[PDB]
């Protein structure tokens, strides 16, 4: 199903930097609590590591480090991390992201932004 991010990547790429920067601040607002920082949304979320930890942060807890792969050895360990974060998104009562977990690992920015914006809409007010 087509949405606003499809409009952004096809017809308005000039607005992309504005999307990137605001989602960077939202993501850093929580990840800075763990002494972590995100400068590039594409490459820094492909691990799943930050995505998993962010999910805990948005629900106000440290995720046990053995629940996922802190240093993923392969593509399939990275895919597991992402889908594990997706399951945490379901636990938080959020609607399932319309993105394949493989795309996040494969550095699909459109998919990553969609996932991150889903978190934004729900966790807007969370300090």
């Amino acid at each position: 199903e087509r949405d606003a991010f499809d409009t952004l990547f096809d017809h308005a790429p000039d607005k992309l930097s504005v999307v990137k920067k605001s989602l960077i601040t939202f993501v850093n607002k929580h990840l800075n609590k763990l002494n972590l920082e995100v400068t590039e949304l594409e490459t820094q979320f492909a691990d799943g590591v930050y995505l998993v930890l962010l999910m805990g942060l948005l629900e106000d807890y440290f995720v046990p480090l053995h629940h996922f792969y802190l240093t993923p050895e392969s593509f399939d360990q990275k895919v597991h991390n992402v889908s594990f974060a997706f399951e945490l998104m379901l636990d938080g009562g959020l609607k399932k992201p319309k993105a394949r977990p493989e795309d996040v690992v494969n550095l699909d920015l459109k998919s990553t932004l969609r996932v991150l914006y889903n978190l934004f809409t729900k966790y807007k007010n969370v300090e």
Partner: peptide, 12 residues
């Protein structure tokens, strides 16, 4: 218009 609201949402 749908993209305009998205950008405004992120800018608030």
């Amino acid at each position: 218009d749908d993209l305009d609201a998205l950008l405004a949402d992120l800018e608030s």
